[PDB]
mmCIF file of C-alpha atoms in Angstrom:
data_model
loop_
_atom_site.group_PDB
_atom_site.id
_atom_site.type_symbol
_atom_site.label_atom_id
_atom_site.label_comp_id
_atom_site.label_asym_id
_atom_site.label_seq_id
_atom_site.Cartn_x
_atom_site.Cartn_y
_atom_site.Cartn_z
ATOM 1 C CA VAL A 1 -22.752 -33.235 19.163
ATOM 2 C CA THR A 2 -19.839 -35.308 20.498
ATOM 3 C CA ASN A 3 -17.372 -37.398 18.464
ATOM 4 C CA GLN A 4 -19.063 -40.457 20.100
ATOM 5 C CA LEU A 5 -22.578 -39.514 18.988
ATOM 6 C CA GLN A 6 -21.203 -39.025 15.542
ATOM 7 C CA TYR A 7 -19.772 -42.472 15.561
ATOM 8 C CA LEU A 8 -23.168 -43.868 16.779
ATOM 9 C CA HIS A 9 -24.915 -42.091 14.004
ATOM 10 C CA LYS A 10 -22.448 -42.657 11.062
ATOM 11 C CA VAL A 11 -21.107 -46.100 11.979
ATOM 12 C CA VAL A 12 -23.617 -47.893 14.294
ATOM 13 C CA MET A 13 -27.021 -46.645 13.065
ATOM 14 C CA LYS A 14 -25.817 -46.833 9.455
ATOM 15 C CA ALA A 15 -24.844 -50.499 9.788
ATOM 16 C CA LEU A 16 -28.062 -51.512 11.611
ATOM 17 C CA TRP A 17 -30.534 -49.469 9.560
ATOM 18 C CA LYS A 18 -29.734 -51.191 6.264
ATOM 19 C CA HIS A 19 -29.484 -54.686 7.756
ATOM 20 C CA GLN A 20 -31.857 -57.295 6.343
ATOM 21 C CA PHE A 21 -33.195 -58.085 9.839
ATOM 22 C CA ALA A 22 -33.817 -54.399 10.781
ATOM 23 C CA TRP A 23 -37.297 -54.055 9.398
ATOM 24 C CA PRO A 24 -39.241 -55.027 12.563
ATOM 25 C CA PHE A 25 -37.386 -52.298 14.479
ATOM 26 C CA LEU A 26 -37.448 -49.344 12.133
ATOM 27 C CA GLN A 27 -40.785 -47.907 13.547
ATOM 28 C CA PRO A 28 -42.559 -48.175 16.876
ATOM 29 C CA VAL A 29 -44.310 -51.406 17.653
ATOM 30 C CA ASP A 30 -47.945 -50.951 16.501
ATOM 31 C CA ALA A 31 -49.781 -53.189 18.970
ATOM 32 C CA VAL A 32 -53.116 -52.830 17.102
ATOM 33 C CA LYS A 33 -51.677 -53.889 13.782
ATOM 34 C CA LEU A 34 -49.847 -56.801 15.343
ATOM 35 C CA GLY A 35 -52.685 -57.929 17.558
ATOM 36 C CA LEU A 36 -50.800 -57.569 20.879
ATOM 37 C CA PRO A 37 -53.216 -55.961 23.363
ATOM 38 C CA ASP A 38 -50.894 -56.632 26.268
ATOM 39 C CA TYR A 39 -47.780 -55.129 24.617
ATOM 40 C CA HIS A 40 -48.030 -51.791 26.427
ATOM 41 C CA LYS A 41 -48.878 -53.434 29.733
ATOM 42 C CA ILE A 42 -45.618 -55.393 29.619
ATOM 43 C CA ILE A 43 -43.338 -52.922 27.892
ATOM 44 C CA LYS A 44 -43.460 -49.556 29.612
ATOM 45 C CA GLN A 45 -40.727 -47.780 27.535
ATOM 46 C CA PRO A 46 -41.179 -48.617 23.847
ATOM 47 C CA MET A 47 -38.189 -47.855 21.668
ATOM 48 C CA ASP A 48 -37.317 -48.267 17.957
ATOM 49 C CA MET A 49 -34.541 -47.336 15.517
ATOM 50 C CA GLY A 50 -36.589 -44.600 13.811
ATOM 51 C CA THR A 51 -36.943 -42.759 17.124
ATOM 52 C CA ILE A 52 -33.254 -43.205 17.872
ATOM 53 C CA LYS A 53 -32.337 -42.042 14.324
ATOM 54 C CA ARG A 54 -34.545 -38.943 14.724
ATOM 55 C CA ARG A 55 -32.994 -38.262 18.102
ATOM 56 C CA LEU A 56 -29.437 -38.440 16.644
ATOM 57 C CA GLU A 57 -30.505 -36.181 13.702
ATOM 58 C CA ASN A 58 -32.045 -33.610 16.060
ATOM 59 C CA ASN A 59 -29.188 -33.580 18.606
ATOM 60 C CA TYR A 60 -31.428 -34.858 21.371
ATOM 61 C CA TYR A 61 -28.721 -36.752 23.203
ATOM 62 C CA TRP A 62 -26.238 -35.199 25.651
ATOM 63 C CA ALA A 63 -23.974 -38.209 25.799
ATOM 64 C CA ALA A 64 -23.287 -41.363 23.824
ATOM 65 C CA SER A 65 -24.257 -43.572 26.750
ATOM 66 C CA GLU A 66 -27.822 -42.107 26.510
ATOM 67 C CA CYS A 67 -28.228 -43.291 22.883
ATOM 68 C CA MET A 68 -26.611 -46.617 23.787
ATOM 69 C CA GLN A 69 -29.314 -47.099 26.512
ATOM 70 C CA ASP A 70 -32.030 -46.479 23.916
ATOM 71 C CA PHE A 71 -30.596 -49.190 21.648
ATOM 72 C CA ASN A 72 -30.414 -51.425 24.626
ATOM 73 C CA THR A 73 -34.023 -50.758 25.618
ATOM 74 C CA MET A 74 -35.188 -51.542 22.088
ATOM 75 C CA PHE A 75 -33.480 -54.985 22.154
ATOM 76 C CA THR A 76 -34.372 -55.718 25.785
ATOM 77 C CA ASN A 77 -38.070 -54.963 25.083
ATOM 78 C CA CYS A 78 -38.036 -57.688 22.407
ATOM 79 C CA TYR A 79 -36.400 -60.292 24.678
ATOM 80 C CA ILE A 80 -38.798 -59.541 27.512
ATOM 81 C CA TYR A 81 -42.024 -59.427 25.516
ATOM 82 C CA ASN A 82 -41.584 -62.115 22.888
ATOM 83 C CA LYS A 83 -41.595 -65.905 23.279
ATOM 84 C CA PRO A 84 -38.062 -67.439 23.298
ATOM 85 C CA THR A 85 -38.976 -69.239 20.005
ATOM 86 C CA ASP A 86 -40.110 -66.131 18.156
ATOM 87 C CA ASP A 87 -37.972 -65.339 15.130
ATOM 88 C CA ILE A 88 -37.890 -61.688 16.105
ATOM 89 C CA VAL A 89 -35.630 -62.661 19.049
ATOM 90 C CA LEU A 90 -33.035 -64.089 16.703
ATOM 91 C CA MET A 91 -33.209 -60.952 14.547
ATOM 92 C CA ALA A 92 -32.692 -58.804 17.597
ATOM 93 C CA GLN A 93 -29.774 -60.902 18.800
ATOM 94 C CA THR A 94 -28.159 -60.593 15.343
ATOM 95 C CA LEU A 95 -28.476 -56.837 15.334
ATOM 96 C CA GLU A 96 -27.344 -56.467 18.944
ATOM 97 C CA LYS A 97 -24.135 -58.416 18.194
ATOM 98 C CA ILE A 98 -23.414 -55.857 15.442
ATOM 99 C CA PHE A 99 -24.201 -53.027 17.797
ATOM 100 C CA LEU A 100 -21.730 -54.413 20.398
ATOM 101 C CA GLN A 101 -19.012 -55.077 17.855
ATOM 102 C CA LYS A 102 -19.264 -51.547 16.539
ATOM 103 C CA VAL A 103 -19.455 -50.022 20.006
ATOM 104 C CA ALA A 104 -16.235 -51.797 20.923
ATOM 105 C CA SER A 105 -14.402 -49.385 18.489
ATOM 106 C CA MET A 106 -16.264 -46.169 19.449
ATOM 107 C CA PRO A 107 -13.866 -43.364 20.451
ATOM 108 C CA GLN A 108 -13.504 -42.147 24.047
ATOM 109 C CA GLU A 109 -15.160 -38.764 25.059
#
């Protein structure tokens, strides 16, 4: 635990988890369900908010920047994999703006 990881858990994750556009990101991408047989060929480090949440709950992270990189990977995966016109891209962008706004007020340490 750091004060920063606390803030990521209580402020950042809280605000994104309950957001109306969060639902595609709450669990790992299931490439079979979604009919995306090339997903895991393109995206080599899958990430999702449930995994990040579990990691915060279980004190997996050593530093805030580690959890921040996982959020980033999650969004980046979406931008890389999806078509520019896919609605999921706009959902991701919306959530990432919240993430950045909240991170701008995270404490030092």
